[PDB]
Amino acid sequence: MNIFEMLRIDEGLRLKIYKDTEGYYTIGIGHLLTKSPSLNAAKSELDKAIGRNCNGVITKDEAEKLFNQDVAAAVRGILRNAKLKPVYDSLDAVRHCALINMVFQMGETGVAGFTNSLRMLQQKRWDEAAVNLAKSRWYNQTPNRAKRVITTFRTGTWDAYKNL
């Protein structure tokens, strides 16, 4: 397991524009196109991202390209964020992936507001952090995914993803 395999499980792969769990137009492996309710606006964003008129469809290779860019942006984003970088650098490589996963899903500003959970993670209070992480809109709206990410933080193993 690695971050790409983890997020591929959590995000799926769809080659046509679809709406994500929040109702926002998306494509590929969780590539958010826009929060606009306009499909035409989403199609424009897609064409800009791919560099050709796609008319709402992409290839697997194009999906994977966007995915590589998006994962790298999540990581580099964490490193550029004064709240997230010290927590990230305090973690082991499996728990790194759990934090990247959260940022991929909800953005850096959103995860940097999990201030008390982040403190518990930095303190390596894993069971406490797990409890705290679950007291969130995140957990309530996407419980199965959040449970997997939280188990990853709790245990520092891939147990929640191995078998999937």
Side-chain angles (χ1 to χ4, degrees), residues 18 34-35 63 71 101 104 106 131 133 138 145 157 164:
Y18 66 97
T34 180
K35 291 190 180 173
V71 171
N101 192 308
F104 189 101
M106 76 202 115
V131 167
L133 282 162
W138 174 55
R145 177 185 183 162
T157 75
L164 296 192

PDB file of all heavy atoms in Angstrom, residues 18 34-35 63 71 101 104 106 131 133 138 145 157 164:
ATOM      1  N   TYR A  18     -18.810  13.451 -13.105  1.00  0.00           N
ATOM      2  CA  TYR A  18     -19.801  12.916 -12.152  1.00  0.00           C
ATOM      3  C   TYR A  18     -19.871  13.921 -11.005  1.00  0.00           C
ATOM      4  O   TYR A  18     -19.034  14.813 -10.863  1.00  0.00           O
ATOM      5  CB  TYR A  18     -19.460  11.521 -11.648  1.00  0.00           C
ATOM      6  CG  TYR A  18     -18.213  11.404 -10.800  1.00  0.00           C
ATOM      7  CD1 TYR A  18     -18.288  11.390  -9.407  1.00  0.00           C
ATOM      8  CD2 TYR A  18     -16.960  11.278 -11.358  1.00  0.00           C
ATOM      9  CE1 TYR A  18     -17.127  11.269  -8.657  1.00  0.00           C
ATOM     10  CE2 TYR A  18     -15.808  11.171 -10.621  1.00  0.00           C
ATOM     11  CZ  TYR A  18     -15.892  11.153  -9.247  1.00  0.00           C
ATOM     12  OH  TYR A  18     -14.708  11.024  -8.541  1.00  0.00           O
ATOM     13  N   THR A  34     -14.924  21.911 -10.030  1.00  0.00           N
ATOM     14  CA  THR A  34     -15.484  23.219  -9.680  1.00  0.00           C
ATOM     15  C   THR A  34     -16.567  23.002  -8.648  1.00  0.00           C
ATOM     16  O   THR A  34     -17.133  21.906  -8.593  1.00  0.00           O
ATOM     17  CB  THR A  34     -16.071  23.955 -10.907  1.00  0.00           C
ATOM     18  OG1 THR A  34     -16.595  25.224 -10.492  1.00  0.00           O
ATOM     19  CG2 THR A  34     -17.228  23.180 -11.541  1.00  0.00           C
ATOM     20  N   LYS A  35     -16.849  23.966  -7.816  1.00  0.00           N
ATOM     21  CA  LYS A  35     -18.004  23.925  -6.942  1.00  0.00           C
ATOM     22  C   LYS A  35     -19.188  24.625  -7.620  1.00  0.00           C
ATOM     23  O   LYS A  35     -20.297  24.687  -7.079  1.00  0.00           O
ATOM     24  CB  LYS A  35     -17.653  24.531  -5.579  1.00  0.00           C
ATOM     25  CG  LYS A  35     -16.687  23.630  -4.817  1.00  0.00           C
ATOM     26  CD  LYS A  35     -16.482  24.046  -3.369  1.00  0.00           C
ATOM     27  CE  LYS A  35     -15.497  23.099  -2.689  1.00  0.00           C
ATOM     28  NZ  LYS A  35     -15.134  23.574  -1.325  1.00  0.00           N
ATOM     29  N   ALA A  63      -6.679  10.606 -16.446  1.00  0.00           N
ATOM     30  CA  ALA A  63      -7.100  10.563 -15.045  1.00  0.00           C
ATOM     31  C   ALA A  63      -5.909  10.376 -14.095  1.00  0.00           C
ATOM     32  O   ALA A  63      -5.818  11.004 -13.057  1.00  0.00           O
ATOM     33  CB  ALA A  63      -8.133   9.465 -14.808  1.00  0.00           C
ATOM     34  N   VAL A  71      -2.145  14.613  -5.929  1.00  0.00           N
ATOM     35  CA  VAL A  71      -1.464  14.082  -4.739  1.00  0.00           C
ATOM     36  C   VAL A  71      -0.274  14.937  -4.408  1.00  0.00           C
ATOM     37  O   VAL A  71      -0.038  15.339  -3.260  1.00  0.00           O
ATOM     38  CB  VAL A  71      -1.039  12.621  -4.940  1.00  0.00           C
ATOM     39  CG1 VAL A  71      -0.156  12.156  -3.808  1.00  0.00           C
ATOM     40  CG2 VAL A  71      -2.311  11.750  -5.086  1.00  0.00           C
ATOM     41  N   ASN A 101      -4.477  12.004   2.789  1.00  0.00           N
ATOM     42  CA  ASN A 101      -5.820  11.618   2.393  1.00  0.00           C
ATOM     43  C   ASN A 101      -6.830  12.693   2.807  1.00  0.00           C
ATOM     44  O   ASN A 101      -7.675  13.125   2.016  1.00  0.00           O
ATOM     45  CB  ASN A 101      -6.107  10.249   2.969  1.00  0.00           C
ATOM     46  CG  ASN A 101      -7.346   9.582   2.411  1.00  0.00           C
ATOM     47  OD1 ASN A 101      -8.420  10.177   2.407  1.00  0.00           O
ATOM     48  ND2 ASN A 101      -7.198   8.373   1.952  1.00  0.00           N
ATOM     49  N   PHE A 104      -6.440  15.791   0.693  1.00  0.00           N
ATOM     50  CA  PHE A 104      -6.962  15.531  -0.651  1.00  0.00           C
ATOM     51  C   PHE A 104      -8.472  15.690  -0.651  1.00  0.00           C
ATOM     52  O   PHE A 104      -9.063  16.266  -1.558  1.00  0.00           O
ATOM     53  CB  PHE A 104      -6.523  14.167  -1.093  1.00  0.00           C
ATOM     54  CG  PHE A 104      -6.776  13.780  -2.534  1.00  0.00           C
ATOM     55  CD1 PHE A 104      -5.723  13.844  -3.445  1.00  0.00           C
ATOM     56  CD2 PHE A 104      -8.010  13.389  -2.956  1.00  0.00           C
ATOM     57  CE1 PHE A 104      -5.962  13.501  -4.770  1.00  0.00           C
ATOM     58  CE2 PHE A 104      -8.249  13.085  -4.264  1.00  0.00           C
ATOM     59  CZ  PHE A 104      -7.217  13.134  -5.176  1.00  0.00           C
ATOM     60  N   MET A 106     -10.567  17.281   1.740  1.00  0.00           N
ATOM     61  CA  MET A 106     -11.221  18.481   2.252  1.00  0.00           C
ATOM     62  C   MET A 106     -10.389  19.749   2.162  1.00  0.00           C
ATOM     63  O   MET A 106     -10.895  20.842   2.439  1.00  0.00           O
ATOM     64  CB  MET A 106     -11.956  18.298   3.552  1.00  0.00           C
ATOM     65  CG  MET A 106     -11.178  18.204   4.796  1.00  0.00           C
ATOM     66  SD  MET A 106     -12.265  17.345   6.003  1.00  0.00           S
ATOM     67  CE  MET A 106     -11.254  15.886   6.192  1.00  0.00           C
ATOM     68  N   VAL A 131     -10.552   9.254  18.629  1.00  0.00           N
ATOM     69  CA  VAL A 131     -11.839   9.731  19.197  1.00  0.00           C
ATOM     70  C   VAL A 131     -12.152  11.127  18.766  1.00  0.00           C
ATOM     71  O   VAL A 131     -13.276  11.483  18.375  1.00  0.00           O
ATOM     72  CB  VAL A 131     -11.815   9.553  20.724  1.00  0.00           C
ATOM     73  CG1 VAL A 131     -12.971  10.322  21.358  1.00  0.00           C
ATOM     74  CG2 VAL A 131     -11.844   8.099  21.155  1.00  0.00           C
ATOM     75  N   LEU A 133     -11.026  12.873  16.167  1.00  0.00           N
ATOM     76  CA  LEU A 133     -11.226  13.003  14.733  1.00  0.00           C
ATOM     77  C   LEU A 133     -12.665  12.686  14.321  1.00  0.00           C
ATOM     78  O   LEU A 133     -13.160  13.224  13.335  1.00  0.00           O
ATOM     79  CB  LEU A 133     -10.259  12.060  13.975  1.00  0.00           C
ATOM     80  CG  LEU A 133      -8.820  12.593  13.880  1.00  0.00           C
ATOM     81  CD1 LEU A 133      -7.866  11.469  13.542  1.00  0.00           C
ATOM     82  CD2 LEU A 133      -8.689  13.693  12.853  1.00  0.00           C
ATOM     83  N   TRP A 138     -16.912  15.712   8.893  1.00  0.00           N
ATOM     84  CA  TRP A 138     -16.245  14.759   8.063  1.00  0.00           C
ATOM     85  C   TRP A 138     -16.678  13.316   8.328  1.00  0.00           C
ATOM     86  O   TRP A 138     -17.079  12.590   7.435  1.00  0.00           O
ATOM     87  CB  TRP A 138     -14.754  14.878   8.224  1.00  0.00           C
ATOM     88  CG  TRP A 138     -13.873  13.925   7.572  1.00  0.00           C
ATOM     89  CD1 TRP A 138     -13.793  13.586   6.247  1.00  0.00           C
ATOM     90  CD2 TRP A 138     -12.866  13.113   8.225  1.00  0.00           C
ATOM     91  NE1 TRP A 138     -12.831  12.638   6.029  1.00  0.00           N
ATOM     92  CE2 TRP A 138     -12.237  12.349   7.231  1.00  0.00           C
ATOM     93  CE3 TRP A 138     -12.466  13.003   9.555  1.00  0.00           C
ATOM     94  CZ2 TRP A 138     -11.195  11.469   7.506  1.00  0.00           C
ATOM     95  CZ3 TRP A 138     -11.441  12.120   9.817  1.00  0.00           C
ATOM     96  CH2 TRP A 138     -10.822  11.366   8.810  1.00  0.00           C
ATOM     97  N   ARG A 145     -15.207   5.998   4.885  1.00  0.00           N
ATOM     98  CA  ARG A 145     -13.876   6.489   4.530  1.00  0.00           C
ATOM     99  C   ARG A 145     -13.177   7.062   5.745  1.00  0.00           C
ATOM    100  O   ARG A 145     -11.991   6.798   5.983  1.00  0.00           O
ATOM    101  CB  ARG A 145     -13.997   7.532   3.410  1.00  0.00           C
ATOM    102  CG  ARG A 145     -12.585   8.121   3.062  1.00  0.00           C
ATOM    103  CD  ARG A 145     -12.754   9.208   2.055  1.00  0.00           C
ATOM    104  NE  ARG A 145     -11.412   9.680   1.699  1.00  0.00           N
ATOM    105  CZ  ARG A 145     -11.314  10.380   0.574  1.00  0.00           C
ATOM    106  NH1 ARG A 145     -12.395  10.621  -0.155  1.00  0.00           N
ATOM    107  NH2 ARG A 145     -10.135  10.840   0.177  1.00  0.00           N
ATOM    108  N   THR A 157      -0.831   1.265  10.644  1.00  0.00           N
ATOM    109  CA  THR A 157      -0.794   0.130   9.764  1.00  0.00           C
ATOM    110  C   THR A 157      -1.785   0.358   8.630  1.00  0.00           C
ATOM    111  O   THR A 157      -2.627   1.245   8.692  1.00  0.00           O
ATOM    112  CB  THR A 157      -1.193  -1.182  10.441  1.00  0.00           C
ATOM    113  OG1 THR A 157      -2.650  -1.193  10.629  1.00  0.00           O
ATOM    114  CG2 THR A 157      -0.416  -1.344  11.746  1.00  0.00           C
ATOM    115  N   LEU A 164      -8.730  -4.595   0.628  1.00  0.00           N
ATOM    116  CA  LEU A 164      -9.607  -3.841  -0.268  1.00  0.00           C
ATOM    117  C   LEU A 164      -9.001  -3.646  -1.660  1.00  0.00           C
ATOM    118  O   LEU A 164      -7.809  -3.922  -1.848  1.00  0.00           O
ATOM    119  CB  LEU A 164      -9.899  -2.470   0.301  1.00  0.00           C
ATOM    120  CG  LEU A 164     -10.662  -2.338   1.621  1.00  0.00           C
ATOM    121  CD1 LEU A 164     -11.058  -0.883   1.755  1.00  0.00           C
ATOM    122  CD2 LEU A 164     -11.837  -3.295   1.650  1.00  0.00           C
TER     123      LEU A 164
END
